[PDB]
Amino acid sequence: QQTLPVAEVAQNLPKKGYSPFGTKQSSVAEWSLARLDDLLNWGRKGSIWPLTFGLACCAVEMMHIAAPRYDMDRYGVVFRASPRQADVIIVAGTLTNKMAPALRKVYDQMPEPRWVISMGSCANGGGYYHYSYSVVRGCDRIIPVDIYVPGCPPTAEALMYGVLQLQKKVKRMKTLQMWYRK
């Protein structure tokens, strides 16, 4: 476990930079590829489009986030209905066996780079129905989950905090910079 620095330590330290990669690149190609990754991540970070799967009980919070108290399009997030145009999927609610193939199908019909947020306990690990004959214990067993938002349901603040955490993950992803090594 680590802890935040103290006031004087902050005073010594410089600006934390903007691109999470930093600005230590050696050669022209390195420095150039650093910027292009930064632009790409900036695009994919600023504009992110959930699919609004929202099966149950959790869905109500998935709507309150769209509501005008913790506005989410403020951050550049919009609910596109069509999975071909949706970039992110907030799986929320329980995943019953009847639904499992449906979720799988919806997921891979969506084009990548696709990130999944598992909202609520029901999706995270099956939640409160974990020992049930009809529920997928978690949603990790159908799809690759990216961010877990604990809660039952998570308070709207918690959900969109997780969204920002996804934005941070979208910010630090290294595709061009490290293709250069590939």
Partner: protein, 54 residues
Amino acid sequence: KWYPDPEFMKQFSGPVMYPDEVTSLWTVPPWNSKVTPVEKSVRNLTLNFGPQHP
């Protein structure tokens, strides 16, 4: 006296009065000449509306 007999009336009554290998084969005499249509099965379109649907 000979009168027109069923043999004489069978001289005609084919699709061709001099039946051949094909006309004699298939015959379509709907006497009324007004054949009713026979209803078909017009299968409809299927939509799996939902679940992924607002």
